[PDB]
Amino acid sequence: KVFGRCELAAAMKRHGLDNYRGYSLGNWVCAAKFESNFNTQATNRNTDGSTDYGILQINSRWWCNDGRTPGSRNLCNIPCSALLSSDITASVNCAKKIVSDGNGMNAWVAWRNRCKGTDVQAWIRGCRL
Ligand SMILES: [Cl-]
Ligand SMILES: [Cl-]
Ligand SMILES: [Cl-]
Ligand code: NA
């Protein structure tokens, strides 16, 4: 599924992401834009051989199981394929663990390089929320 901006903002908000660990909704939307272009089926292979899955490009090195990332963990207790669903529940629940791990949203390198410190409220401007 490819979400619309305000559609994704609504789905995130309903699942409790807005101001989760202090991060306003626009941070999460910004992060989703640059990680996946709002496409739930997005995948990206990393140099280390792990893969990133879903709207928030959650990595198999630590967070989901894909059966092909040697020495990895599955701390969200999910198959990485659940991160590709048109329903974002699994992505959001696993993002909550990730952003709680100590480094906040810096876990997402594209958040750090493309959203952090920017006018992230623009990402939810005009949305009926
Ligand atoms: Cl915001
Ligand atoms: Cl594995
Ligand atoms: Cl933080
Ligand atoms: Na894994």
In short:
It is found in: Secreted. The chain is mostly helical. The protein contains four helices and three strands.
**Proportion of residues in helical segments:** 25-40%
Ligands and ions found? chloride ion, sodium ion
The CATH topology label is: Lysozyme
Total individual domains = 1
Number of distinct beta strands: 3
Q: CATH architecture, please?
A: Orthogonal Bundle
How do the helices and strands follow one another from N- to C-terminus? Answer: HHEEEHH
The gross shape turns out to be: globular
As laid out across the biggest beta sheet, the strand order is 1-2-3
Disulfide bonds: 6-127, 30-115, 64-80, 76-94
Catalytic activity: Hydrolysis of (1->4)-beta-linkages between N-acetylmuramic acid and N-acetyl-D-glucosamine residues in a peptidoglycan and between N-acetyl-D-glucosamine residues in chitodextrins
Subunit structure: Monomer.
Protein name: Lysozyme C
